[PDB]
Every structure is written in C-alpha cells, then in structure tokens.
C-alpha cells in the first residue's frame, strides 16, 4: 500500500518525511513543503505557510502548483488558477473536495493532498517521483536517516534543514525561528504511553514505530492540554497508510468526536461509503482505512436527499433530476418503472412501432436506426415479408440539380396482395385503386380522413396506420400494432428491437450503409441505384449557412420551446436534418419548417405537447389557412362536423398521435359545403335529408326538432 | 450461406468521449471522473460476476483537455492499472496464476481473459471484444450487450433515459464526484 509515499505535517510544527523521519521545526514563513526539483520539467510544487492562531500552530495557506494549475487554499477558501471555486471542483485529472473533515486535492497520477483546515496536511505521491523531489518531505529515495540532512557532506539540525527549504515573498523578509530551549513535562501521567502502546494501535506497532510520536505527544502535552490528540490522530493516519488496521481509541474524554444521527465517527472505516445511489461501491474498492463519519452496516448512505444513512429499501430513486420516494411509480409512453428494491423495477407497456420518412431523404426505422437515403425510385417502405398482407410503398423523386436533392412524392399502400392500392400524392390527392377519392372514406375497414389540412390519416384494420404530412412538404409516418414485432421487412426494418439487424437484406446479411441497403428494395429494376453522399450542401453558400444555422439552432437552445423534449429525445439527429435540409433545399423555409414540424411531431409521439414554437418562424403556415378555418397546435381527434354530430361517425374512432394543423375552432362545425358555421347554422340530417336548424317537422307519426344541430324526436 | 461461427461483441471507447457500445449504439460523453466501462457486477446477485473495467480521462501534461486514459482491468481478485504507457499489477486477493494474458499487439496493449480481450492503443482508445457468453449480463458504458440498442442508456437503477449525460453520470465510481455539465 502507501508504504513510503507519504509525508505529513501536524500539531506543533511536526514534520514527517517520506522515508520515516520526524522532526519539529517551528518555522513561520512560506516553505517548499515538496517540489519536483530533480527533473528537466517540474510536475508539482506544493508549499506551506505556517502561522499562529492566538497561540495554536496552524497552516494558513497552501499553494500547490502542478502542471500549469495553481491551487491556493487559505481562509477556508480555495482559489483555482486565481478564481474562487465552490467545492467540489473537478476537471480532467484534478478533483478538489470537502470530503469528510478535510479539504482533499487529488491530481491523478501526481499527488494526493489532504488538509484538515487548521494544522494537519498530508501528501501522497506517485512512486515515479522517487529521488526527484526535494523539500521538507525529503527526497523519496527510501533511506530515512542518511540523505535528508547532508548539505554538501555536512549534517544539519532540523532547524537548519527547515531553514534551507525556505522561500520568501517578493517583498517579504521573514526571520528564522530561534531554537526552542529545553523541554519539560514529558509523559508524567503516562497518557501517551498508555494510549499509543495500548490495544488500539497494536498492529500499528508492527508497521510504524511510535518513538517519535511518543516524544511529540509529550511535547504537545507541554503545550495546551486540549491539543495532545494531534499526534494520536497522525499515528492513526500513518498506521492506516502503511496498511495496518487502526482501532478506535477515542473515548468521550480523549478528544471526543461527533457525527450525524445515523452516522458514527469511526477510525478505519471503509473509504467508499456505500450509498443506495451506488449501493455496492464498497465491493471491490482499493483504499486503506480512513477516519470519518460512516454508517452502521446494512444501511447505506442516502446522497439523494441527505436523510442520513437509510435502509436499502426505503431510500429514494432519481429520474431526470426528479426525486421519487420508494413506493412511487412513473410510466413513460413505452414503459412504467416503480421505485423499489433500491432500484427502478421497469415493466413495458406495449408500444406501437413508428417508422417515418422526413425531408424526403431521412428515414427513422422501427428500430430507430436513423439513416439518409438519396434515391430516385419507388422503395418498399415496409412490408410484412412473411405474406403480402400489406405493402407500404414510397416514391422518392429527385427535386433539383444535385443528385442528393430529393422529395417524397407519393405513398402507395398496396393491400391484399395488390388487390387494393391507396395512393396519397404530394398535393393531397388520394387515389383509391387509381381513382380519385375525396376524404373521408370508410370501406373494407379502411378509414381515410384529414385531422387537419396538414395531415392525412389512412387507418387500416390489418394493423398499420399511415399518417402522411403534406404541409410544408411531403413526409410519411407509419404506426404498427406491436403484434407484428420481428416480422416485417422493407426499408423500415424488421421491427425486432435490434439496431444491428435493420440492414438485413433478403440475402441474409446485414448491409453496410443506407444507400447500399436501399438499393436492394427498389420497386423497379430500371431505377438508378442510390449513392452515398458525403458533401454537405451547407458548405456551398455562406448566406444559406447563416440562415440555416440561425434558424435550425432553435432546436438545441435550452431556453427554446423544444427544450421540454430534450430530456427525452436527443435532438442532434433532428438538428442535422434541419441543417442538411435547409442548406440543400431550394425552398429553405419549407424544409426548415418541415424539420421543425418533424421534431415536434416525434416528441408529441413520445408524449410531450410542444406548443408555440413558431415564434417569428414558419408563420406563413399560420396565415395560408383555408378561409373560415384556423391553426391549432394540439389537434388530437377527428374534425368536428355537422354530419358527425347529427348521426355519429366511424372517422372519430381512430387514435392517432396529436398532430397540428388547420381545423375549425371549437364550438364550430363544417357543413357539407365545408364552410365553418356554429352549431345553430348547421342542420340535423335524418335519412340523409337536410333538416334545417330550429325546425319542427312531422315524420311517421312523430314530431321532431333540430336544436343546435342536434336531432330530437317525440311520440 | 454463411458459416455459423460466433463473433465477439465489440465496445469502443475513444477520442474526446465517443462510445460505440456492444449493441452498436453510438454517443458522446465528456466525463472527468472514473466511469465503469464494463462489469459483470450488476445483477440480482453481483457476486457471480467476474470482471470490471473502469476508465477516466488523464491529461498528460496539464489539467485541461484529455490526452490519455487510465484503465482499471479488475479480474476477480486481480487488478491491472493501464496508464502512462504501460501496465501494472496490484494483485491483492488470492495469489494463483494470472487469469489474464498480456501481449504487445502492434500499437496496442492486449489483455486477454480467455473470453474477454481488452485492447488499449496506449493513448486514448479502448476496444473491448467479448465472447458471446457474456451476452445480456454486462453493464456500464458499453451497454448491457443485449442486441437491443434503444435501451442501452440504462443507468445504475436501470431507468432507461433518452439522454447521454444522465447515462454517463450514473456510472461514476465515486458519488462524491461532481456530475459532468452539458458537453459543448
Ligand atoms: C476567513 O474568511 C472569512 C470570510 O469568508 C473572514 O470573515 C474570516 O476572518 C477569515 N478567517 C477566518 C479564520 O475565518
Ligand atoms: C538517488 O539519487 C542519488 C543522487 O545522486 C543517486 O546517487 C542514487 O543512485 C539514486 N538512487 C535511486 C535508487 O534512484
Ligand atoms: C401513470 O402514473 C401516474 C402517476 O402515478 C398515474 O396517475 C397513472 O394512472 C399511471 N398510468 C396508468 C396506470 O396507466
Ligand atoms: C373488414 O375485413 C373483413 C375481413 O376481410 C371483411 O370481411 C369485412 O367486410 C371488412 N369490413 C367490415 C366492416 O368488417
Ligand atoms: C441472489 O439474489 C436473490 C435475491 O434476488 C437471493 O434470494 C439469493 O440468495 C442470492 N444468491 C446468492 C448466491 O447470493
Ligand atoms: Ca533519504
Ligand atoms: Ca430491427
Ligand atoms: Ca440494450
């Protein structure tokens, strides 16, 4: 262990070098406590300043210089490179903490400096610094009695030795301590002998000799009689550092210590206090005994709310910075996790898988393997490749000068082995079996309707739902009842919760990149193979650069509307999509707002209602609405219609993620004419007959009324 | 038609903090403390597990941007610290023969354990190759090796998060260490 890689300074100016020496040196200036001084380039330079508190010998300032880092500890405060910092302060290779009763500065592979704050200070050094250091801590050559005190072949007294390692301030001339006259007292009552030679440090007698510590205890007895326990504390530290196990020597009279209610003050407690945040940290630790507050065995520490040491099964859990007292639960969209057993017990609610094609080029599969596809053909977007039950096709078409300028142009749901084909174009035109079909339409369990002017919903009973975006451009989203898990094929991958198998082709091997995978799923053999694209279109135009940057940066802004989803969905792929689109898109605003809409819609699929994100952006999509309609951010149901309120509707029995778009406002309905009128202006419909509002009629021996669009009949 | 030989899973921890876990997921995490790059010491029983790998970012001449790594290859009761350009051995437990083997593979220190081979470029990249036996029973910053990359952001309490910072902050060895802030 830390056999001879330790030096220390304690109590009444007692200095202990690496190799085992002890001597008193009552200096009162700055001193080179240790320094890498036999190397071409120095690694550490730790200096001490020793002063008086009324009469108590203390350390008033430590200045550790290491590898370009300056660390000045004084006045209970720490200065890191000239700036005050709040404990703990951590950086690559460096960490300073208020651990336990001290201030500990560990510069990994360099040094370990403990400073109790008043009098003690201990240095652990790497083994590679042997023979290359010089200072009060010695030379680290391993030979105690022979090489610290020979200044050009002459032996020195500890006063002279400590005076050699002196360093004045720039404008300071500190004197030297004149030798202290003879001592007195000694250990008359025998306290030093009784304790140090007592049971507690038994095995410590086998590692560290107590003679100098006995002398120092007696000498401190000559000083105040509330300060003789410094030497015992130092002997405990040294015995722990050699490897031996010190035992508890403190008694309510022998410098008693106090700890919190659940925390006991121990000598030689395990340094790594298990805490149910990491309740098994103390498993395979490597660090010797350390003194301090500890917990009774079994009840690990609670560092999450600081309720003292708590039983393993009654301490909280943490999710996203939120505290959860054990017993509580939290369900995500996809899974529910209960805080119990000191952990999160997580079960999964069934989750419909979600493929999507955004920007006409980017594809997020069911396994969430985002990849780019710059192709010009019809690609089998998804297909239950056991059978031909359903086959979602997407036609991606090149839209500009560059081969990597693509737009989605159609979504052709083939069905029943090609017997049926629902083809949603990019203008919004919907073709049922290559025949124009307005919306809604409900037949063969297939339901087509527009929740708003921006989206078209193609809901089927076979399991898959298509949600297609037209504004600002053409994007597709696909939802699957999780029953089809690990069965599908096509571009969107086999939906088996594995991102490494998504590129499984029909030949039984995982394909390498996006385009190489896609060129196996082309619909027509005459298509041209997609090509891998490295050239970022962002590099072309500086004005395109600044425009795309200044707008797409709204994604990752922690103060932005999108921040609410940052802690759930990582927005880096979405920001890359926005950059690539806007830079490559001829209609930069269109692709930009398509990217922002895509991010919003994905987050709302995960279950977050991002709202009011179009501040000063994409407002031409606010204004362009059809007359008598209006925008809405949370459209989470069917469209309120006069026919529907009159006689119900199959349309409104479909659950889809809440999309945004243009709809009639609440309290209004659109008649068969499509104009938006309140309920009072739209008629009840009986047998398909327009029965005007507020009109009493006769039918089949009955009297009926049309109140607020609602039909009532009596008799 | 492919031969059916099993292939070793691969975790890659390199650069300023890029990780490619066993299940193929990729992310970036700039951590400064000691982080469990792998272990079998996670389960309803921790003690039927064998090994453990921690890493942390050494600066080699300052306290600034990272310059190298520091690995702690524990194997049962043995231990191997990889730093500064070579290896060490702080074997503390039962003193039998090494359950590891050491080799100088090109510009790499390669340490095998008959089912778990660690390759260290001697500066900053670690590539770990595991047998298919350890599938689903490991954890840390190389995921849990389950061929399910979506949930590889499983923290200490197995609360799968959508954020890299929380997943990294979970696996720090010493809870006293400060959590890394937002990477820049
Ligand atoms: C330490 O700093 C505080 C202010 O932070 C000051 O009031 C005090 O006098 C200083 N010295 C001591 C011994 O507290
Ligand atoms: C330590 O340094 C002294 C200084 O000259 C040298 O004579 C001696 O050989 C060195 N020994 C070791 C073990 O480094
Ligand atoms: C999810 O958790 C919340 C809070 O405990 C609860 O109100 C809600 O009912 C849960 N969802 C379920 C049980 O589907
Ligand atoms: C739904 O599908 C079944 C099976 O193909 C078919 O028999 C039925 O006519 C369809 N429509 C309804 C309303 O069930
Ligand atoms: C493993 O853990 C279970 C509880 O999860 C416990 O019942 C069992 O005794 C443990 N086995 C060993 C060998 O520790
Ligand atoms: Ca010496
Ligand atoms: Ca898959
Ligand atoms: Ca996983």
XYZ file of C-alpha atoms in Angstrom, chain A residues 328-646:
319
model
C -43.842 5.740 -6.202
C -44.041 4.845 -9.879
C -43.683 6.668 -13.162
C -44.934 5.411 -16.516
C -43.434 6.595 -19.774
C -45.199 6.273 -23.103
C -43.413 2.951 -23.624
C -42.709 1.613 -20.126
C -43.519 2.014 -16.438
C -40.881 1.937 -13.709
C -41.509 1.719 -9.958
C -39.002 2.927 -7.363
C -38.398 -0.200 -5.300
C -35.656 -2.517 -4.123
C -33.269 0.419 -4.203
C -33.623 0.369 -7.997
C -36.174 1.015 -10.746
C -38.327 -2.040 -11.429
C -39.295 -1.496 -15.065
C -42.027 -3.271 -16.997
C -43.024 -2.352 -20.535
C -46.406 -1.316 -21.781
C -46.918 -2.437 -25.396
C -45.686 0.240 -27.795
C -46.775 0.608 -31.433
C -43.677 0.913 -33.570
C -43.121 4.033 -35.625
C -41.336 4.392 -38.942
C -41.013 7.721 -40.652
C -39.555 9.360 -43.742
C -38.769 13.032 -43.206
C -37.241 15.553 -45.561
C -37.767 13.150 -48.446
C -34.375 11.679 -47.653
C -34.069 10.753 -43.980
C -35.597 7.565 -42.603
C -36.150 6.651 -38.962
C -36.983 2.959 -38.858
C -38.867 0.911 -36.259
C -35.566 0.105 -34.550
C -34.847 3.873 -34.596
C -31.880 3.410 -36.937
C -31.827 6.858 -38.489
C -30.233 6.867 -41.932
C -30.170 9.044 -45.024
C -31.487 7.902 -48.396
C -30.902 9.932 -51.561
C -32.690 7.768 -54.097
C -34.951 8.206 -57.112
C -37.299 5.227 -57.406
C -40.222 3.619 -55.615
C -38.993 1.857 -52.492
C -40.840 -0.722 -50.423
C -41.139 1.355 -47.280
C -42.483 -1.544 -45.232
C -43.910 -5.000 -45.815
C -44.833 -7.948 -43.598
C -42.418 -10.092 -45.567
C -43.938 -13.385 -44.486
C -47.004 -12.642 -46.633
C -48.328 -9.849 -48.837
C -50.926 -8.673 -46.312
C -49.848 -5.038 -46.620
C -47.083 -3.230 -48.500
C -46.416 0.452 -47.864
C -44.514 1.969 -50.801
C -42.879 5.391 -51.007
C -41.820 7.096 -54.238
C -38.831 9.373 -53.645
C -38.047 11.712 -56.521
C -35.066 13.939 -57.226
C -36.025 17.602 -56.922
C -33.088 19.663 -58.134
C -29.731 19.981 -59.814
C -27.974 17.886 -57.175
C -28.404 14.111 -57.062
C -28.972 14.454 -53.305
C -31.951 16.831 -53.660
C -34.958 14.582 -53.056
C -38.616 14.961 -52.140
C -41.138 12.344 -51.156
C -43.834 12.319 -53.827
C -46.342 9.562 -53.047
C -47.319 6.897 -50.534
C -48.848 3.840 -52.191
C -50.317 1.425 -49.661
C -50.720 -1.805 -51.602
C -53.010 -4.242 -49.848
C -54.459 -7.757 -50.107
C -51.538 -8.745 -52.299
C -52.042 -5.772 -54.590
C -55.811 -6.130 -54.855
C -56.207 -2.660 -53.320
C -53.933 0.375 -53.622
C -54.437 3.626 -51.715
C -52.108 6.220 -53.234
C -51.684 9.510 -51.370
C -49.897 12.003 -53.603
C -47.945 15.089 -52.558
C -50.654 17.629 -53.423
C -53.094 15.844 -51.117
C -54.856 13.917 -53.865
C -55.897 10.454 -52.688
C -56.340 7.712 -55.284
C -58.339 4.632 -54.307
C -57.429 1.891 -56.797
C -56.064 4.559 -59.158
C -59.316 6.526 -58.956
C -59.711 9.907 -57.294
C -61.409 9.591 -53.911
C -62.114 12.604 -51.732
C -61.899 12.416 -47.962
C -63.152 10.878 -45.709
C -63.753 7.328 -46.955
C -64.647 4.284 -44.851
C -64.743 0.871 -46.516
C -63.172 -2.577 -46.109
C -62.227 -1.425 -42.577
C -60.013 1.258 -44.187
C -60.648 4.817 -42.974
C -59.182 7.851 -44.743
C -59.626 11.310 -43.275
C -57.829 14.570 -42.628
C -57.469 15.545 -38.959
C -56.297 18.915 -40.264
C -55.249 20.460 -43.544
C -51.652 19.347 -42.968
C -52.129 15.592 -42.490
C -53.968 12.612 -43.964
C -54.757 9.506 -41.911
C -55.034 6.118 -43.630
C -56.133 3.765 -40.845
C -56.410 0.066 -41.644
C -57.550 -2.930 -39.665
C -54.587 -5.038 -40.789
C -52.532 -3.361 -38.068
C -50.682 -0.469 -39.691
C -51.731 3.169 -39.729
C -50.299 5.734 -42.142
C -50.142 9.400 -41.149
C -48.940 11.482 -44.080
C -47.850 15.123 -43.950
C -48.365 17.463 -46.905
C -47.579 20.881 -45.399
C -44.966 22.313 -45.656
C -43.797 19.319 -47.697
C -44.374 15.583 -48.010
C -43.397 13.345 -45.077
C -44.693 9.955 -44.013
C -45.232 8.320 -40.631
C -46.155 4.685 -40.061
C -47.503 3.106 -36.881
C -47.621 -0.626 -36.191
C -49.507 -2.555 -33.554
C -46.585 -4.266 -31.776
C -48.022 -7.654 -32.728
C -46.017 -7.527 -35.962
C -42.766 -7.281 -33.985
C -39.892 -9.160 -35.565
C -41.874 -9.930 -38.711
C -41.661 -7.022 -41.159
C -39.196 -6.321 -43.963
C -38.507 -3.332 -46.178
C -36.798 -0.022 -45.635
C -38.174 0.490 -42.162
C -36.521 -2.686 -40.868
C -37.891 -5.812 -39.287
C -39.104 -4.203 -36.036
C -37.392 -6.560 -33.590
C -35.696 -4.156 -31.133
C -32.212 -4.508 -32.605
C -30.448 -1.735 -34.496
C -27.732 -4.016 -35.863
C -30.196 -6.162 -37.833
C -32.038 -3.315 -39.546
C -29.889 -3.714 -42.661
C -30.764 -7.388 -43.025
C -31.431 -7.827 -46.730
C -33.184 -10.704 -48.491
C -29.814 -12.452 -48.838
C -29.314 -12.990 -45.111
C -26.561 -10.447 -44.404
C -26.558 -7.017 -42.777
C -25.936 -4.338 -45.388
C -23.242 -1.744 -44.819
C -24.695 1.739 -45.349
C -28.038 3.320 -46.067
C -27.957 3.551 -49.856
C -26.398 0.116 -50.283
C -29.284 -1.282 -48.247
C -31.990 0.704 -50.027
C -30.834 -0.294 -53.496
C -31.981 -3.830 -52.650
C -35.580 -2.718 -52.033
C -36.245 -0.758 -55.220
C -39.630 -1.411 -56.786
C -38.484 -1.238 -60.425
C -35.348 -2.921 -61.751
C -34.834 0.024 -64.115
C -34.220 2.511 -61.309
C -30.802 4.026 -60.686
C -29.001 2.909 -57.545
C -28.819 5.434 -54.730
C -25.409 6.906 -53.996
C -23.649 7.710 -50.742
C -23.479 11.447 -50.045
C -20.597 12.992 -48.100
C -20.652 16.535 -49.459
C -22.598 18.700 -47.045
C -24.686 21.221 -49.023
C -24.154 23.554 -46.082
C -20.636 24.351 -47.328
C -21.892 25.931 -50.565
C -23.478 29.284 -49.711
C -22.462 31.463 -46.780
C -25.879 33.124 -46.680
C -27.506 29.683 -46.736
C -25.071 28.811 -43.948
C -26.039 31.686 -41.694
C -29.758 31.331 -42.428
C -29.839 27.602 -41.681
C -27.651 27.993 -38.602
C -29.596 30.877 -37.091
C -32.886 29.077 -37.562
C -32.113 25.376 -37.008
C -30.210 26.335 -33.855
C -33.642 26.901 -32.306
C -33.722 23.139 -31.782
C -30.875 22.725 -29.289
C -31.489 26.001 -27.448
C -32.164 25.061 -23.794
C -34.435 28.096 -23.408
C -36.406 27.243 -26.558
C -39.842 25.664 -26.702
C -38.134 22.427 -27.786
C -36.162 22.093 -24.538
C -39.082 20.272 -22.925
C -38.323 17.295 -25.181
C -34.532 17.467 -24.884
C -34.583 15.405 -21.687
C -36.494 12.700 -23.628
C -35.410 12.781 -27.290
C -31.864 13.671 -28.251
C -32.245 16.495 -30.816
C -28.872 16.013 -32.541
C -30.223 13.949 -35.488
C -33.073 16.424 -35.870
C -30.616 19.319 -35.925
C -28.519 17.520 -38.536
C -31.689 17.003 -40.569
C -32.612 20.680 -40.296
C -29.118 21.764 -41.331
C -28.958 19.388 -44.290
C -32.462 20.199 -45.499
C -32.250 23.979 -45.236
C -28.809 24.099 -46.839
C -29.826 21.721 -49.629
C -33.441 22.836 -50.000
C -34.244 25.333 -52.729
C -37.204 26.397 -50.564
C -35.160 26.815 -47.408
C -38.126 27.861 -45.283
C -40.164 24.857 -46.425
C -37.561 22.254 -45.494
C -36.677 24.170 -42.319
C -40.256 24.172 -41.076
C -40.591 20.562 -42.192
C -37.673 19.670 -39.932
C -39.117 21.611 -37.003
C -42.526 20.030 -37.559
C -40.855 16.625 -37.680
C -39.111 17.197 -34.360
C -42.328 18.427 -32.785
C -44.336 15.506 -34.112
C -41.789 12.934 -32.957
C -41.732 14.459 -29.483
C -45.536 14.551 -29.359
C -45.494 10.895 -30.360
C -43.330 10.275 -27.308
C -45.933 12.192 -25.297
C -44.883 15.847 -24.987
C -47.100 18.719 -26.134
C -44.650 21.194 -27.624
C -46.536 24.425 -28.256
C -45.988 27.942 -29.591
C -42.666 27.074 -31.209
C -43.263 29.112 -34.385
C -42.195 32.444 -32.868
C -41.055 34.607 -35.764
C -40.654 31.480 -37.898
C -42.916 29.428 -40.173
C -45.783 31.896 -39.720
C -46.674 31.818 -43.411
C -48.121 28.438 -42.447
C -50.252 30.174 -39.850
C -51.659 32.567 -42.413
C -52.167 30.379 -45.501
C -55.071 28.502 -43.899
C -58.301 27.908 -45.827
C -60.845 30.609 -45.111
C -63.095 30.129 -42.051
C -60.558 27.671 -40.586
C -57.722 28.433 -38.197
C -54.478 26.975 -36.935
C -54.312 24.661 -33.931
C -51.254 23.248 -32.197
C -52.925 20.283 -30.476
C -55.351 18.586 -32.862
C -55.930 15.294 -31.064
C -59.179 13.927 -32.503
C -61.425 13.869 -35.551
C -62.703 17.023 -37.221
C -65.996 18.270 -35.727
C -68.608 18.009 -38.477
C -72.317 18.720 -38.707
C -72.971 15.271 -40.164
C -70.984 13.689 -37.342
C -72.794 15.487 -34.547
C -76.070 14.640 -36.268
